Tab-separated table of C-alpha atoms in Angstrom:
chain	number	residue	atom	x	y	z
A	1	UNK	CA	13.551	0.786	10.219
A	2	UNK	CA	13.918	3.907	12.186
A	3	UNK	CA	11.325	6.770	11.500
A	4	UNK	CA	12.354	10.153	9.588
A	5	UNK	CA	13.792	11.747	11.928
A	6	UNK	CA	14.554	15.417	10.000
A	7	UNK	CA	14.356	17.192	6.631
A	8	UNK	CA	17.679	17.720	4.493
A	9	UNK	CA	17.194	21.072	2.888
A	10	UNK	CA	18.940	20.162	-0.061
A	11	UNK	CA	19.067	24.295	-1.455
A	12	UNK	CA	20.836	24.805	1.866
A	13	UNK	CA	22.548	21.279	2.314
A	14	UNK	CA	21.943	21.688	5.910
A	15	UNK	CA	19.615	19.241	8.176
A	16	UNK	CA	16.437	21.182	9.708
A	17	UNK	CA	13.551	19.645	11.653
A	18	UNK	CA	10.325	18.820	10.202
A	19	UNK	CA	9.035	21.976	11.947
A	20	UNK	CA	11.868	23.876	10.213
A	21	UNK	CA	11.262	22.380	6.992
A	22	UNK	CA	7.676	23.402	7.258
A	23	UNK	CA	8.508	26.703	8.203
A	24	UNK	CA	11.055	27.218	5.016
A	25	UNK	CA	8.012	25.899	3.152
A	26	UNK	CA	9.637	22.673	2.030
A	27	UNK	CA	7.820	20.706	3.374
A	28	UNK	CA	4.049	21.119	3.502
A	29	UNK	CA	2.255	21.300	6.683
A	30	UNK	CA	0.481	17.870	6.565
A	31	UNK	CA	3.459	15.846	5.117
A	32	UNK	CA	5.198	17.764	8.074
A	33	UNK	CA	2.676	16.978	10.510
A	34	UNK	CA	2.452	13.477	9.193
A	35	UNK	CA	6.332	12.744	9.812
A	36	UNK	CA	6.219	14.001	12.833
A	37	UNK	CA	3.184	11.833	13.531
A	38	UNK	CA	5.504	8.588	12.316
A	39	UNK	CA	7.599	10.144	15.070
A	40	UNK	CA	5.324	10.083	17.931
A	41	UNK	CA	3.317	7.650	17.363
A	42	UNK	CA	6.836	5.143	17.485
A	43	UNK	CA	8.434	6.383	20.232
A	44	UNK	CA	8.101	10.185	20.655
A	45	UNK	CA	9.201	13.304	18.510
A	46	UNK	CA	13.317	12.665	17.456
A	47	UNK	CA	15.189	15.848	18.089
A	48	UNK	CA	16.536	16.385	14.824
A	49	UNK	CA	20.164	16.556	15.997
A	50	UNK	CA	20.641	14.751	19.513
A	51	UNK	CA	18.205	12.181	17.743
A	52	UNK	CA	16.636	11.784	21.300
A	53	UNK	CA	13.311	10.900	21.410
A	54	UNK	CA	10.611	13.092	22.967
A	55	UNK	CA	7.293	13.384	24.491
A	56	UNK	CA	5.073	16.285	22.560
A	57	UNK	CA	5.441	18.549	25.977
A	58	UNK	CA	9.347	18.390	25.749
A	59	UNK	CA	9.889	18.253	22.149
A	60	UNK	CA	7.816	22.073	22.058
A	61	UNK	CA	10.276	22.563	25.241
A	62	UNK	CA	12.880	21.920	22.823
A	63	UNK	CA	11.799	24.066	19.960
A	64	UNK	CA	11.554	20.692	17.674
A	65	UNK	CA	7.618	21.557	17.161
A	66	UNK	CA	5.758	24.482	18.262
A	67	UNK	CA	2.602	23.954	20.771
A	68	UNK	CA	0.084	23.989	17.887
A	69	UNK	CA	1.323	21.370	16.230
A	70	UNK	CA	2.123	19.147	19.375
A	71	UNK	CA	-1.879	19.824	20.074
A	72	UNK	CA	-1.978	18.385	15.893
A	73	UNK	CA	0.323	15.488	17.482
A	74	UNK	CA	-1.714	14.277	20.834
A	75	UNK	CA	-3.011	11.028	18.632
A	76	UNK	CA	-0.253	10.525	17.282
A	77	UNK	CA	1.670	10.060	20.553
A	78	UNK	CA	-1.005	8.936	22.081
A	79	UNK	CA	-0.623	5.683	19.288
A	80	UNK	CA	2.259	5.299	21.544
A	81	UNK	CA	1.385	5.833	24.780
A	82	UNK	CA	-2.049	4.758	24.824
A	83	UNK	CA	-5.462	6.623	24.253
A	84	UNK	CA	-4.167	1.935	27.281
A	85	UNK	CA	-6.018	1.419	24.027
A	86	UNK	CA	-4.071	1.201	20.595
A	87	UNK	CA	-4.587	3.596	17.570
A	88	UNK	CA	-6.151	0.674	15.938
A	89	UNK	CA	-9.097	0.626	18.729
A	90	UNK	CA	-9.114	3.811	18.700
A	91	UNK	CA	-10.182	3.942	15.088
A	92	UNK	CA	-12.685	1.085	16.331
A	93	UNK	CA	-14.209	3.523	19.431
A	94	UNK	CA	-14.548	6.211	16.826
A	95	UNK	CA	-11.920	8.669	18.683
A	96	UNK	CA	-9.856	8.445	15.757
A	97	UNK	CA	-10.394	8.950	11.058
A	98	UNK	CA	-9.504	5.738	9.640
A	99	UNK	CA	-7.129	7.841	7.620
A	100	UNK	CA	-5.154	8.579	10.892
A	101	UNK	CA	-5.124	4.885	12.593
A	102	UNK	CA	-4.477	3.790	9.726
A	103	UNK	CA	-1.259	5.646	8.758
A	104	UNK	CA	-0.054	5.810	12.781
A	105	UNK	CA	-0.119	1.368	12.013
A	106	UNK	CA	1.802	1.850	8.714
A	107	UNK	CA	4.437	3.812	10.575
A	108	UNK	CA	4.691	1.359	13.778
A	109	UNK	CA	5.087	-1.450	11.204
A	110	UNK	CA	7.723	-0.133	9.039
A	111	UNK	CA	9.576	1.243	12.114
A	112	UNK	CA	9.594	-2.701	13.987
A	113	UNK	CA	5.594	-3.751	14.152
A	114	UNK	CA	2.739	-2.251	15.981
A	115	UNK	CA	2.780	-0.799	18.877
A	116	UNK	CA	0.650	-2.426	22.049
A	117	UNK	CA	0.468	0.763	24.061
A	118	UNK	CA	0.259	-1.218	27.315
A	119	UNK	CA	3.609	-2.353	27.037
A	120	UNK	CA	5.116	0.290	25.424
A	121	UNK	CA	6.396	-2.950	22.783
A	122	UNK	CA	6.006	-3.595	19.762
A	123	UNK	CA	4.178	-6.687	18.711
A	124	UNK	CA	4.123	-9.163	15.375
A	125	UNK	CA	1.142	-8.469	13.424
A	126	UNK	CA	0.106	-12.341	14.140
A	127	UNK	CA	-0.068	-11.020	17.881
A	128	UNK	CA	-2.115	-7.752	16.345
A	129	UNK	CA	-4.201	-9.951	14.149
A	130	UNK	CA	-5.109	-11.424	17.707
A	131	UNK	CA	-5.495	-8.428	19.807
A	132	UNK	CA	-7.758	-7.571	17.766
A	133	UNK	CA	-6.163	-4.427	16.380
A	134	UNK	CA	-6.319	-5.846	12.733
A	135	UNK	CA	-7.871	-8.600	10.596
A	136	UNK	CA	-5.946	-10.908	8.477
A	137	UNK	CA	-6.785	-8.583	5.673
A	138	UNK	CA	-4.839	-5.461	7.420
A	139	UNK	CA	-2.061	-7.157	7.934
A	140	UNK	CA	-1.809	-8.644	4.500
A	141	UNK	CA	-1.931	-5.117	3.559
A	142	UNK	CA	0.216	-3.983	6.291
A	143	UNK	CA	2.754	-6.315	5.242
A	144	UNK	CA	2.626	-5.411	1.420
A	145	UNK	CA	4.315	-1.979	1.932
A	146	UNK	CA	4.125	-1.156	-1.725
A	147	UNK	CA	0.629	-0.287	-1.540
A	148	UNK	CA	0.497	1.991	1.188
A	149	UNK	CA	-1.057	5.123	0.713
A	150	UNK	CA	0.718	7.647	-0.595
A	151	UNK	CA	-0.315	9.811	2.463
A	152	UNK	CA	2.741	12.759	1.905
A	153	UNK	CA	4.275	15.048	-0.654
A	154	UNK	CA	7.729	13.883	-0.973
A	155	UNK	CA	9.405	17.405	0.040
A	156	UNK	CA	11.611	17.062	-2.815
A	157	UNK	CA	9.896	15.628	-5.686
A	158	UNK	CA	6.831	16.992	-4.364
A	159	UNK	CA	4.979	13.757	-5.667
A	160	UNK	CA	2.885	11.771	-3.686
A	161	UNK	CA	4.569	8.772	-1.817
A	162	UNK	CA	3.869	6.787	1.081
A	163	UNK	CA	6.281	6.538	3.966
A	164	UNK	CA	7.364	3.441	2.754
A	165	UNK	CA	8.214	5.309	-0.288
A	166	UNK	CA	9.979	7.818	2.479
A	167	UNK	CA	11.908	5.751	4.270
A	168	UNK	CA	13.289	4.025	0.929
A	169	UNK	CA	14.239	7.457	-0.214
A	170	UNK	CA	15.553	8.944	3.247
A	171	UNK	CA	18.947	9.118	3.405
A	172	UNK	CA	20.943	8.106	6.880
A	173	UNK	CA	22.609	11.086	8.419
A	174	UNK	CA	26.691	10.585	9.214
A	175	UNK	CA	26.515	8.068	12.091
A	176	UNK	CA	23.982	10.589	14.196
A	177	UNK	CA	22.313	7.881	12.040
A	178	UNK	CA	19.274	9.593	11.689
A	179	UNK	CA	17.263	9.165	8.702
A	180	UNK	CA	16.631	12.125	7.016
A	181	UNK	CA	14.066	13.327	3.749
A	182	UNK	CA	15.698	15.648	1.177
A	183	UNK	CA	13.454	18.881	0.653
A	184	UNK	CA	13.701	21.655	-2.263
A	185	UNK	CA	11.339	24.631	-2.587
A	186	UNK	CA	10.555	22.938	-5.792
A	187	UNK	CA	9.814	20.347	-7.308
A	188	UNK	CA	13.156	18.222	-8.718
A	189	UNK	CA	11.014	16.584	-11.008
B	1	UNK	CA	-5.802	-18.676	2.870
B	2	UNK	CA	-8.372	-15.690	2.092
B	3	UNK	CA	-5.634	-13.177	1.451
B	4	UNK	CA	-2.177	-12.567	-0.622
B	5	UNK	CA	0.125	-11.126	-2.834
B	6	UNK	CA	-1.273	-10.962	-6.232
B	7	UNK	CA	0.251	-14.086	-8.608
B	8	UNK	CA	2.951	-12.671	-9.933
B	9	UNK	CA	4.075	-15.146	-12.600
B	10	UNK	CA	4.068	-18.734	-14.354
B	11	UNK	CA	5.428	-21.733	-13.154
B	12	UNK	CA	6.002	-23.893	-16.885
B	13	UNK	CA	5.961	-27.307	-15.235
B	14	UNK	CA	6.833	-29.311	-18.140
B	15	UNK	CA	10.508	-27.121	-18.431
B	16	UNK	CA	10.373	-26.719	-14.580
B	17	UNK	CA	10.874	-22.866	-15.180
B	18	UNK	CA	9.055	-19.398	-13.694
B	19	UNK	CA	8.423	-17.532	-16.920
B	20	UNK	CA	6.453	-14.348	-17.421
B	21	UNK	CA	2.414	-14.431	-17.700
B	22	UNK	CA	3.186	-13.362	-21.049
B	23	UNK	CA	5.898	-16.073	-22.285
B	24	UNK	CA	2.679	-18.317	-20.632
B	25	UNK	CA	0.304	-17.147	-23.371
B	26	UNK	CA	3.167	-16.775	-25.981
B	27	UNK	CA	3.911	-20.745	-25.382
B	28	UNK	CA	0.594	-21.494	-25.129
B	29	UNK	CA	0.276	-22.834	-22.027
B	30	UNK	CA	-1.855	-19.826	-20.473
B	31	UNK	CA	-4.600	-18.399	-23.057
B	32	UNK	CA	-4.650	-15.021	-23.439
B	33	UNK	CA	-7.605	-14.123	-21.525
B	34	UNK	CA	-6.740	-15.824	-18.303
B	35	UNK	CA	-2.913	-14.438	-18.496
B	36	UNK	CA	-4.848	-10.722	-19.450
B	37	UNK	CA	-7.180	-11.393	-16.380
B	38	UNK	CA	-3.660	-12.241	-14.010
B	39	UNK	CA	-2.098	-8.696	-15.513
B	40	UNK	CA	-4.962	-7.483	-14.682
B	41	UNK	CA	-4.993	-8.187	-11.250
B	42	UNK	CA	-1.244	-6.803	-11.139
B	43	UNK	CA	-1.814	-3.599	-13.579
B	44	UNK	CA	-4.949	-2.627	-10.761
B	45	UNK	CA	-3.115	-3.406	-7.657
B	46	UNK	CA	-0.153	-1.195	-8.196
B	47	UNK	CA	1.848	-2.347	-11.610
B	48	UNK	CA	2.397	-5.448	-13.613
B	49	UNK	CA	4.820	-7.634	-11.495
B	50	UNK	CA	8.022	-8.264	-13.385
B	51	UNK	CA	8.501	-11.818	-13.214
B	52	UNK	CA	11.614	-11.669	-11.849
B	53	UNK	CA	12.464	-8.795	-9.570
B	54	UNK	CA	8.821	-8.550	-8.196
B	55	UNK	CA	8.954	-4.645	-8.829
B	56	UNK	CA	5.800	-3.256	-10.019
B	57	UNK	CA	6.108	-2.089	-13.418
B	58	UNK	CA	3.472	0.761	-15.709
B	59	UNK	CA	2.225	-0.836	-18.495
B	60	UNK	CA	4.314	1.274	-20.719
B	61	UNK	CA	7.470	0.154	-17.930
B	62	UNK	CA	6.354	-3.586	-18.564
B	63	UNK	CA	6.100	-3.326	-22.425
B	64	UNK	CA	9.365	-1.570	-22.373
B	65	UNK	CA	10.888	-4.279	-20.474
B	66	UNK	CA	9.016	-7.599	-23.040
B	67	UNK	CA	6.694	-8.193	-19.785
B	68	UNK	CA	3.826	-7.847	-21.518
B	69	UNK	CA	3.135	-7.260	-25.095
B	70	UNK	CA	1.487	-4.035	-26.931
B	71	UNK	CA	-1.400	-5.485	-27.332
B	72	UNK	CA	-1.397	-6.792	-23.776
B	73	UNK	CA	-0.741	-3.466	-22.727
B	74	UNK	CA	-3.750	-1.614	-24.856
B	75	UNK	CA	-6.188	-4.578	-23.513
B	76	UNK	CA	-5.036	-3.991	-19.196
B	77	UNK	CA	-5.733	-0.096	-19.452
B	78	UNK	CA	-8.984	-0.405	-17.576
B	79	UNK	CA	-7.097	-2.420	-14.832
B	80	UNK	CA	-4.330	0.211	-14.310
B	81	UNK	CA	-6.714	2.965	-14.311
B	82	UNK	CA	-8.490	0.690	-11.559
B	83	UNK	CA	-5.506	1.720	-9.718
B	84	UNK	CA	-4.670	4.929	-10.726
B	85	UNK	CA	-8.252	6.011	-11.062
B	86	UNK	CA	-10.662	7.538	-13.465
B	87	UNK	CA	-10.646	9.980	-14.646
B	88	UNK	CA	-12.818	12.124	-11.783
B	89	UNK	CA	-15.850	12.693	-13.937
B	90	UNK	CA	-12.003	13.877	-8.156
B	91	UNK	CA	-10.702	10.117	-9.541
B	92	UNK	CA	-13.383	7.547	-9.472
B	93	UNK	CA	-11.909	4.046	-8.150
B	94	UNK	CA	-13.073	0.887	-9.720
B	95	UNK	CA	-16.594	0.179	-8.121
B	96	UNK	CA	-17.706	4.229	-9.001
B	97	UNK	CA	-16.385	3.654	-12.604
B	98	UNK	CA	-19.051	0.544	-12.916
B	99	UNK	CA	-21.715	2.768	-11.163
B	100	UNK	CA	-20.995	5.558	-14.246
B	101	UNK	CA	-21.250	2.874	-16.972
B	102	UNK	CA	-17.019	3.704	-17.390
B	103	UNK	CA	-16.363	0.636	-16.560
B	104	UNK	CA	-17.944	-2.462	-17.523
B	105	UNK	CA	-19.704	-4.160	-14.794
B	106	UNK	CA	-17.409	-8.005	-15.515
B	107	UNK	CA	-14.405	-5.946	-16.112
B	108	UNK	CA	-15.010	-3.225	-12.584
B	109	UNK	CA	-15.509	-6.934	-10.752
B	110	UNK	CA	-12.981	-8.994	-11.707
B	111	UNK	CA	-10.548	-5.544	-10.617
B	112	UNK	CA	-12.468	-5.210	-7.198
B	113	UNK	CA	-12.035	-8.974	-6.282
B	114	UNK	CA	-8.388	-8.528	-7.367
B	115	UNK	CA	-7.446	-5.864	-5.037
B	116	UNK	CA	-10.097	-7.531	-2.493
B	117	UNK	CA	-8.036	-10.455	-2.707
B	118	UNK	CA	-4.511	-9.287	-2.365
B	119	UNK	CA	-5.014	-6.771	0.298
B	120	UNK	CA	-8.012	-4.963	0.061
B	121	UNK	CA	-9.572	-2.325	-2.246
B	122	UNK	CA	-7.892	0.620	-3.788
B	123	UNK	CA	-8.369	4.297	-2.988
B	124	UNK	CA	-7.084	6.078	-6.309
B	125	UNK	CA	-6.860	9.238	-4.037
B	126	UNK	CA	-3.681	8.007	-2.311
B	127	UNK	CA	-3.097	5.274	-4.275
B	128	UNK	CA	-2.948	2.459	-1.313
B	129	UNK	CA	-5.275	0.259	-0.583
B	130	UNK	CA	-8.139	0.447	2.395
B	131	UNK	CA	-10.118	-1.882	4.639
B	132	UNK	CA	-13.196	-2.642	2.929
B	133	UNK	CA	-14.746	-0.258	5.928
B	134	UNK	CA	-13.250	2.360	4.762
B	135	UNK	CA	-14.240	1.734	1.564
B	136	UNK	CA	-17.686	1.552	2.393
B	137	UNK	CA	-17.199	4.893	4.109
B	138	UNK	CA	-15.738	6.568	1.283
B	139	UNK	CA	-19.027	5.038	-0.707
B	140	UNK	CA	-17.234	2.877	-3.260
B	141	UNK	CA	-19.206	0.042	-2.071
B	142	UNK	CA	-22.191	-0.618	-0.284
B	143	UNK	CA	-22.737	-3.377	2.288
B	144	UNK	CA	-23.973	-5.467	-0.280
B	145	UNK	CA	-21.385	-5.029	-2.298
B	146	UNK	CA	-18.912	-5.403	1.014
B	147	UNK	CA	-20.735	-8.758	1.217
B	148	UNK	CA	-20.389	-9.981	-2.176
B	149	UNK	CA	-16.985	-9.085	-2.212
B	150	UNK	CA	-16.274	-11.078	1.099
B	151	UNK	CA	-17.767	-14.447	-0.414
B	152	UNK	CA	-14.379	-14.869	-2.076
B	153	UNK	CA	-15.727	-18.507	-2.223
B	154	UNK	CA	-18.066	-17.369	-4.687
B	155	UNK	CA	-16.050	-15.282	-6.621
B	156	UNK	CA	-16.719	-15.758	-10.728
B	157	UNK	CA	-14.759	-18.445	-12.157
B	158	UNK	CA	-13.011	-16.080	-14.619
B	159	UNK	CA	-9.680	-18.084	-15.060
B	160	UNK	CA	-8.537	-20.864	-16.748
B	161	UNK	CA	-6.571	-22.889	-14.592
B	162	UNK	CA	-3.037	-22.948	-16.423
B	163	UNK	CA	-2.509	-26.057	-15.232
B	164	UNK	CA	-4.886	-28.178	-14.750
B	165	UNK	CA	-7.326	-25.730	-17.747
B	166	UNK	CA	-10.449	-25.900	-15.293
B	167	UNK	CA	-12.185	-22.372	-14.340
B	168	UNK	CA	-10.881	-20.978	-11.486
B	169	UNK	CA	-11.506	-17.575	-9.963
B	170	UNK	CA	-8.323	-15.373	-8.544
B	171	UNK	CA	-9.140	-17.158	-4.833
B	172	UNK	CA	-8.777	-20.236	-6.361
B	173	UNK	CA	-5.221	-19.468	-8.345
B	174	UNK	CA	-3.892	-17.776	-5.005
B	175	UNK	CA	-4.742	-21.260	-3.340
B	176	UNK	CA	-3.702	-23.075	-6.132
B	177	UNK	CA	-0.332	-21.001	-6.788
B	178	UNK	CA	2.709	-21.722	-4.957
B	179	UNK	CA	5.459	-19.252	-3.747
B	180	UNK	CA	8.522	-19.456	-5.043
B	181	UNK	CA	11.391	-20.143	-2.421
B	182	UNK	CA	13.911	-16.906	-2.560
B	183	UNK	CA	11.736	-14.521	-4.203
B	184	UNK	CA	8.393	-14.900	-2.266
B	185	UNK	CA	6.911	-14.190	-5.348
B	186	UNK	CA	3.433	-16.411	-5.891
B	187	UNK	CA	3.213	-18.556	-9.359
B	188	UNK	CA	0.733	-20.193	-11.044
B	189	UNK	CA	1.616	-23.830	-12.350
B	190	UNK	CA	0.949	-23.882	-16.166
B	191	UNK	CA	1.154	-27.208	-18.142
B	192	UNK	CA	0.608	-27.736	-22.081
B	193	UNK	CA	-2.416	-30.396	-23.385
């Protein structure tokens, strides 16, 4: 699947970027942070409109996050590019919270697998399992995407939900195809 | 294999048909204590596992929907809240509830080797589950614990096999269980004696 690329600011029906959605304060800062971590850490930050994807330096070129946050970001592209060493062995050499390796694998796998930073592709968890960057047990809960943790407020419901839960309740932006999260200032439940 | 999804329902061999956990007990074929101890390991890995779509149902969800029974449902609170979490008193996950006498120290273990099992243990914070580092990190478990947990091999013997009506623990019915073609969803052979 393709990462959440923007926020659809449902009061407004317009499409904003994370940042933006975190600046209207519809999206907190860490489920805004954490998106935009999905972001990096599978490719680089997605412009919210061009959909192109972008390293941290560009992307606050861009105005699609402001320098503090890409300085938030640096693991989370670094998943990508390398630390190369993977987020997973970074966890391992104690540069990077559990919490954080952790979620950066979830949202490699549920965008196409994890990422092997040395070759910039993505690999099948059997070839992760091997590498070294998780045990049989990770992937078994890599692989059951139900459980994940429910690491972000859903901007909308403002309940907790994975980014599993995200992705299944993204919506896919006329043909820019962009997946994007519905946000309200409050909660629709 | 030392990990998997959690059995999700009954295979009745003799009318070569999945049927719930439930309509195992109800026909006899599973008793109720083995068939509570399978919900069990559904209700504290995320829901009770509707037989047929796989979704992952409350308990109030799966007694809506004939999953499970009332009763059923009263008897697998423990085992959801293993999942949910306790009640702080700051939700405590399974292995803390044991630790504050919440939780029953048979009950707390059958829902840590469940999760163990399936995936690995559950962090009622964010709901998901965690690598049994972690979990020693966040102080659910202690090494020992970790270690105990790990001997899946020597896991209690807290089922009745449904088919063959030998004890079995979970490791053994996740060995013993068989996943069903389309659905991917893992049964448990039950036969009538």
């Amino acid at each position: 699947s393709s990462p959440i690329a923007a926020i659809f600011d449902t009061e407004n029906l317009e499409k904003i970027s994370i940042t933006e959605g975190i600046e209207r304060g519809i999206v907190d800062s860490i489920t805004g942070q954490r998106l935009l971590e999905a972001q990096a850490c599978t490719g680089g930050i997605i412009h919210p409109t061009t959909g192109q994807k972008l390293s941290l330096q560009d992307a606050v070129s861009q105005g699609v996050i402001d320098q503090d946050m890409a300085t938030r970001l640096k693991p989370a592209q670094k998943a990508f590019i390398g630390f190369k060493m993977s987020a997973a062995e970074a966890v391992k050499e104690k540069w990077l919270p559990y919490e954080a390796g952790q979620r950066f694998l979830e949202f490699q796998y549920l965008t196409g697998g994890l990422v092997d930073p040395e070759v910039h592709g993505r690999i099948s968890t059997e070839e992760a399992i091997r590498k070294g960057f998780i045990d049989g047990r990770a992937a078994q809960r890599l692989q059951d995407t139900s459980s994940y943790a429910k690491i972000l407020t859903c901007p909308k419901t403002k309940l907790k939900i994975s980014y599993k839960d995200a992705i299944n309740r993204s919506m896919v932006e006329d043909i820019t195809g962009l997946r994007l999260l519905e946000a309200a200032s409050v909660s629709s439940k």
